[PDB]
Amino acid sequence: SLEARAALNQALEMKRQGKREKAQKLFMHALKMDPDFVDALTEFGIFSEEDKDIIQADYLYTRALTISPYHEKALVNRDRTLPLVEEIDQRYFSIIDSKVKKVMSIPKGNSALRRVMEETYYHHIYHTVAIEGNTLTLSEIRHILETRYAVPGASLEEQNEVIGMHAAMKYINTTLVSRIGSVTISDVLEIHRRVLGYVDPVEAGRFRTTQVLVGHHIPPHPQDVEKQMQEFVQWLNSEEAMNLHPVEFAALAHYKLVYIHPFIDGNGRTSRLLMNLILMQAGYPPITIRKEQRSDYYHVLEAANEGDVRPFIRFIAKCTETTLDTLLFATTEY
Amino acid sequence: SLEARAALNQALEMKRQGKREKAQKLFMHALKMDPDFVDALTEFGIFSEEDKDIIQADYLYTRALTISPYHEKALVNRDRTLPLVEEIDQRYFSIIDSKVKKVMSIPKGNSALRRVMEETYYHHIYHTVAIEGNTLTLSEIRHILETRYAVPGASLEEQNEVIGMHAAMKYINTTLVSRIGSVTISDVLEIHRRVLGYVDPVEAGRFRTTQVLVGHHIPPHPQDVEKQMQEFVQWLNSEEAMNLHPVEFAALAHYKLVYIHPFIDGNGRTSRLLMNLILMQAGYPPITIRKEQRSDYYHVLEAANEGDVRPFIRFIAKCTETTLDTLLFATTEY
Ligand SMILES: Nc1ncnc2c1ncn2[C@@H]1O[C@H](COP(=O)(O)OP(=O)(O)OP(=O)(O)O)[C@@H](O)[C@H]1O
Ligand SMILES: Nc1ncnc2c1ncn2[C@@H]1O[C@H](COP(=O)(O)OP(=O)(O)OP(=O)(O)O)[C@@H](O)[C@H]1O
Ligand SMILES: [Mg+2]
Ligand SMILES: [Mg+2]
């Protein structure tokens, strides 16, 4: 492409000109033009290291080698950054584990903690539906679940989504948390049943029969969905997956489920519930993917489809840390 | 019982005294005291004939013989009334068939008719939920189904019941009406699924596992429910049932289903939908059991349990006629 090289050649000049803005947009626009443009990736990676964003740099070098495996400028930079980010990632998970041990060391009966867990429960439901486009407020959700009376000027669908979540959550907490290691299709179906039961009871708790598009992702064909779910379940209960880091295992479980997209709707909600199940079985608190992180959440998912899950694994880890911060703040406060 | 005979002996005296009130209450109160009091039944039957209520009289004579088969006063009166009401019942069904032929003779495309069918559709849903204790108005139901937005100050359950009905009705009309003669368990499950899906998706479309009380009726034990439903389906598709009068067949189908009470909730609604299916397959319009007829509806059901279904069959026939009157009034008007 002619216009692809134009933007990149314009980008380098601005960088070495001494731009205050830094012409980061010029680089982004180049890869907007052609995202598989090996030269634009490496040079953008080099630019990222100067701003001390080595993880972003490594991502770009990794993406370049999937396109052009024997691109030398990528290969030499990759070999340097490959083990460096491996360390940085490991170090981050140690920082998580430390904050988790602080939370785990607290006794369950602690009165200050249980206040926070009660308040943050309503927040959990808000964010998982809000990220879909649910327009219900926190106080509205509080009113719906406690009173069981509909709020004025809001679709019954949106209000049924809230009830579906609370049902699914109470089910998980009651039944599924107590059994560590072994999970089945039936378990996933029973979560989804309650998630999408009050909205669409016909399709609730069974696989889709039609092919769909999820953002920019094309999941396995309905005929292949069962086969994929059969493999997904095997992976969950495999020794490999047990030996993975809880946060990492929780993340990979999330992605794999939304990748398969076995249901017509409610795949994200159920995946995030399954994510939080995995964590709570491993002794971690249930984490929140906030409403505000929608764009980022989609970008890292898109990145995972193109063949690098690490950004998504980091995103889940970012959320985990943010949760642990919130709990330790409120618990220490009260 | 001493107090049972007291009221009855008091009743006869008042009747033959020449009471303007007629001491009908004295007779009712006697059978309130003891409903299996053979002497009170026969004498109340005799009293009913004087007011030209021979069907009511026959009922009482029939109830007496289940208790005391060889009670002479009942036996002689029964033998007289037995064929008389048989004629009266047959004559009523002829009066129905005539009014049905007037309705059936109208072309489907008729513009005046389709106005009525559209308006009365919302009435159908109102009455079937209103009779349960649903507190939604006609305009509220109209708003819920058209806008799909919840009305202010009404339980989500009540509003989900409305959506459940509309779903079940649209399903029946689309799928089930086109196949005359053959119905399965799966079909009944698929109706109930949509009826109770939006309220309780967990229990929607499957048999209850717990024994319950329905008014004053004890249905078959959960273990026996499947066996009863298996027999119920056989009866529906039997030649006997095809040769029954549509209104009668529709009625018996209703009662048999609510008798079995296979689901935890939503047995009446589904039964009334199945009732109206049977009618529409036989070429009759779907009929309405009004909200106001709740007490009567329960009394005739209780009577059917004690071992005389005829009152219920008449009640359904009464509703059918009332429907046919409403249609022919509105159709002729417009
Ligand atoms: N590019 C992508 N690749 C894989 N999965 C994706 C991608 N984009 C989005 N997803 C996932 O698919 C979900 C959308 O599918 P679906 O509508 O079945 O889920 P939902 O639960 O209805 O929506 P939400 O999770 O927002 O409530 C998203 O929530 C997300 O988790
Ligand atoms: N004595 C009785 N014997 C047999 N069946 C009865 C008796 N009394 C009531 N019923 C039936 O059982 C139904 C009640 O059971 P259930 O609650 O499962 O039905 P529902 O659909 O939830 O209630 P409704 O029909 O009022 O909406 C009544 O609607 C009626 O049709
Ligand atoms: Mg969705
Ligand atoms: Mg009920």
PDB file of N, CA and C in Angstrom, chain A residues 68-106:
ATOM      1  N   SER A  68       5.572 -11.578   9.384  1.00  0.00           N
ATOM      2  CA  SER A  68       6.881 -11.807   8.765  1.00  0.00           C
ATOM      3  C   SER A  68       7.832 -12.429   9.786  1.00  0.00           C
ATOM      4  N   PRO A  69       7.816 -13.774   9.954  1.00  0.00           N
ATOM      5  CA  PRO A  69       8.666 -14.452  10.939  1.00  0.00           C
ATOM      6  C   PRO A  69      10.167 -14.124  10.886  1.00  0.00           C
ATOM      7  N   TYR A  70      10.689 -13.824   9.689  1.00  0.00           N
ATOM      8  CA  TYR A  70      12.125 -13.636   9.477  1.00  0.00           C
ATOM      9  C   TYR A  70      12.460 -12.160   9.220  1.00  0.00           C
ATOM     10  N   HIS A  71      11.595 -11.247   9.682  1.00  0.00           N
ATOM     11  CA  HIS A  71      11.893  -9.816   9.688  1.00  0.00           C
ATOM     12  C   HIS A  71      12.921  -9.543  10.795  1.00  0.00           C
ATOM     13  N   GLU A  72      14.119  -9.107  10.390  1.00  0.00           N
ATOM     14  CA  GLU A  72      15.302  -9.084  11.254  1.00  0.00           C
ATOM     15  C   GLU A  72      15.142  -8.047  12.372  1.00  0.00           C
ATOM     16  N   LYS A  73      14.642  -6.855  12.027  1.00  0.00           N
ATOM     17  CA  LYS A  73      14.539  -5.742  12.976  1.00  0.00           C
ATOM     18  C   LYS A  73      13.594  -6.122  14.124  1.00  0.00           C
ATOM     19  N   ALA A  74      12.532  -6.869  13.797  1.00  0.00           N
ATOM     20  CA  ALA A  74      11.594  -7.400  14.784  1.00  0.00           C
ATOM     21  C   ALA A  74      12.273  -8.497  15.615  1.00  0.00           C
ATOM     22  N   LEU A  75      12.948  -9.423  14.922  1.00  0.00           N
ATOM     23  CA  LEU A  75      13.523 -10.635  15.516  1.00  0.00           C
ATOM     24  C   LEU A  75      14.531 -10.281  16.619  1.00  0.00           C
ATOM     25  N   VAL A  76      15.393  -9.289  16.358  1.00  0.00           N
ATOM     26  CA  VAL A  76      16.453  -8.893  17.298  1.00  0.00           C
ATOM     27  C   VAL A  76      15.835  -8.171  18.506  1.00  0.00           C
ATOM     28  N   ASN A  77      14.828  -7.324  18.256  1.00  0.00           N
ATOM     29  CA  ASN A  77      14.150  -6.561  19.307  1.00  0.00           C
ATOM     30  C   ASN A  77      13.285  -7.500  20.160  1.00  0.00           C
ATOM     31  N   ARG A  78      12.638  -8.472  19.506  1.00  0.00           N
ATOM     32  CA  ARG A  78      11.784  -9.464  20.168  1.00  0.00           C
ATOM     33  C   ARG A  78      12.608 -10.262  21.187  1.00  0.00           C
ATOM     34  N   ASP A  79      13.741 -10.814  20.734  1.00  0.00           N
ATOM     35  CA  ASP A  79      14.600 -11.687  21.544  1.00  0.00           C
ATOM     36  C   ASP A  79      15.034 -10.971  22.832  1.00  0.00           C
ATOM     37  N   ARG A  80      15.208  -9.647  22.751  1.00  0.00           N
ATOM     38  CA  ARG A  80      15.578  -8.821  23.895  1.00  0.00           C
ATOM     39  C   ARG A  80      14.380  -8.675  24.843  1.00  0.00           C
ATOM     40  N   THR A  81      13.214  -8.336  24.280  1.00  0.00           N
ATOM     41  CA  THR A  81      12.016  -7.979  25.050  1.00  0.00           C
ATOM     42  C   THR A  81      11.267  -9.229  25.537  1.00  0.00           C
ATOM     43  N   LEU A  82      11.388 -10.343  24.805  1.00  0.00           N
ATOM     44  CA  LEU A  82      10.644 -11.581  25.090  1.00  0.00           C
ATOM     45  C   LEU A  82      10.801 -11.978  26.558  1.00  0.00           C
ATOM     46  N   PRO A  83      12.033 -12.197  27.078  1.00  0.00           N
ATOM     47  CA  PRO A  83      12.211 -12.578  28.481  1.00  0.00           C
ATOM     48  C   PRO A  83      11.977 -11.427  29.474  1.00  0.00           C
ATOM     49  N   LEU A  84      12.160 -10.185  29.010  1.00  0.00           N
ATOM     50  CA  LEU A  84      12.038  -8.991  29.846  1.00  0.00           C
ATOM     51  C   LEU A  84      10.591  -8.832  30.334  1.00  0.00           C
ATOM     52  N   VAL A  85       9.626  -8.940  29.411  1.00  0.00           N
ATOM     53  CA  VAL A  85       8.198  -8.805  29.739  1.00  0.00           C
ATOM     54  C   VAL A  85       7.730 -10.038  30.523  1.00  0.00           C
ATOM     55  N   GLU A  86       8.323 -11.202  30.227  1.00  0.00           N
ATOM     56  CA  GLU A  86       8.059 -12.443  30.960  1.00  0.00           C
ATOM     57  C   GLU A  86       8.331 -12.219  32.456  1.00  0.00           C
ATOM     58  N   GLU A  87       9.420 -11.499  32.756  1.00  0.00           N
ATOM     59  CA  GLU A  87       9.795 -11.132  34.124  1.00  0.00           C
ATOM     60  C   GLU A  87       8.790 -10.110  34.672  1.00  0.00           C
ATOM     61  N   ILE A  88       8.519  -9.064  33.883  1.00  0.00           N
ATOM     62  CA  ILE A  88       7.639  -7.954  34.277  1.00  0.00           C
ATOM     63  C   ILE A  88       6.238  -8.493  34.602  1.00  0.00           C
ATOM     64  N   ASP A  89       5.763  -9.448  33.792  1.00  0.00           N
ATOM     65  CA  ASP A  89       4.453 -10.078  33.974  1.00  0.00           C
ATOM     66  C   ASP A  89       4.448 -10.881  35.281  1.00  0.00           C
ATOM     67  N   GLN A  90       5.491 -11.696  35.478  1.00  0.00           N
ATOM     68  CA  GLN A  90       5.660 -12.526  36.679  1.00  0.00           C
ATOM     69  C   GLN A  90       5.689 -11.644  37.934  1.00  0.00           C
ATOM     70  N   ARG A  91       6.424 -10.529  37.860  1.00  0.00           N
ATOM     71  CA  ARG A  91       6.572  -9.602  38.978  1.00  0.00           C
ATOM     72  C   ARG A  91       5.208  -9.004  39.351  1.00  0.00           C
ATOM     73  N   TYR A  92       4.386  -8.692  38.341  1.00  0.00           N
ATOM     74  CA  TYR A  92       3.066  -8.092  38.555  1.00  0.00           C
ATOM     75  C   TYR A  92       2.153  -9.063  39.317  1.00  0.00           C
ATOM     76  N   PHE A  93       2.241 -10.350  38.970  1.00  0.00           N
ATOM     77  CA  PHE A  93       1.404 -11.391  39.557  1.00  0.00           C
ATOM     78  C   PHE A  93       1.825 -11.656  41.009  1.00  0.00           C
ATOM     79  N   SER A  94       3.105 -11.419  41.321  1.00  0.00           N
ATOM     80  CA  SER A  94       3.610 -11.489  42.691  1.00  0.00           C
ATOM     81  C   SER A  94       3.017 -10.346  43.525  1.00  0.00           C
ATOM     82  N   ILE A  95       2.915  -9.160  42.913  1.00  0.00           N
ATOM     83  CA  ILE A  95       2.344  -7.969  43.548  1.00  0.00           C
ATOM     84  C   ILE A  95       0.854  -8.209  43.830  1.00  0.00           C
ATOM     85  N   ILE A  96       0.184  -8.945  42.933  1.00  0.00           N
ATOM     86  CA  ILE A  96      -1.216  -9.337  43.116  1.00  0.00           C
ATOM     87  C   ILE A  96      -1.314 -10.303  44.304  1.00  0.00           C
ATOM     88  N   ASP A  97      -0.516 -11.377  44.265  1.00  0.00           N
ATOM     89  CA  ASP A  97      -0.536 -12.449  45.268  1.00  0.00           C
ATOM     90  C   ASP A  97      -0.344 -11.875  46.680  1.00  0.00           C
ATOM     91  N   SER A  98       0.512 -10.853  46.802  1.00  0.00           N
ATOM     92  CA  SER A  98       0.798 -10.201  48.080  1.00  0.00           C
ATOM     93  C   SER A  98      -0.458  -9.504  48.618  1.00  0.00           C
ATOM     94  N   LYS A  99      -1.167  -8.789  47.736  1.00  0.00           N
ATOM     95  CA  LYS A  99      -2.379  -8.041  48.095  1.00  0.00           C
ATOM     96  C   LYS A  99      -3.532  -9.012  48.391  1.00  0.00           C
ATOM     97  N   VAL A 100      -3.509 -10.184  47.747  1.00  0.00           N
ATOM     98  CA  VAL A 100      -4.506 -11.234  47.955  1.00  0.00           C
ATOM     99  C   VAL A 100      -4.316 -11.846  49.350  1.00  0.00           C
ATOM    100  N   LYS A 101      -3.055 -12.067  49.741  1.00  0.00           N
ATOM    101  CA  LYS A 101      -2.716 -12.657  51.042  1.00  0.00           C
ATOM    102  C   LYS A 101      -3.169 -11.726  52.176  1.00  0.00           C
ATOM    103  N   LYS A 102      -3.095 -10.409  51.947  1.00  0.00           N
ATOM    104  CA  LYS A 102      -3.589  -9.407  52.902  1.00  0.00           C
ATOM    105  C   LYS A 102      -5.107  -9.557  53.079  1.00  0.00           C
ATOM    106  N   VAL A 103      -5.815  -9.792  51.967  1.00  0.00           N
ATOM    107  CA  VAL A 103      -7.276  -9.940  51.946  1.00  0.00           C
ATOM    108  C   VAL A 103      -7.669 -11.299  52.545  1.00  0.00           C
ATOM    109  N   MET A 104      -6.927 -12.354  52.185  1.00  0.00           N
ATOM    110  CA  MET A 104      -7.218 -13.726  52.623  1.00  0.00           C
ATOM    111  C   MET A 104      -6.954 -13.883  54.128  1.00  0.00           C
ATOM    112  N   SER A 105      -5.993 -13.117  54.661  1.00  0.00           N
ATOM    113  CA  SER A 105      -5.588 -13.198  56.072  1.00  0.00           C
ATOM    114  C   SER A 105      -6.698 -12.679  56.998  1.00  0.00           C
ATOM    115  N   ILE A 106      -7.552 -11.787  56.480  1.00  0.00           N
ATOM    116  CA  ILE A 106      -8.687 -11.237  57.231  1.00  0.00           C
ATOM    117  C   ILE A 106      -9.681 -12.367  57.499  1.00  0.00           C
TER     118      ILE A 106
END
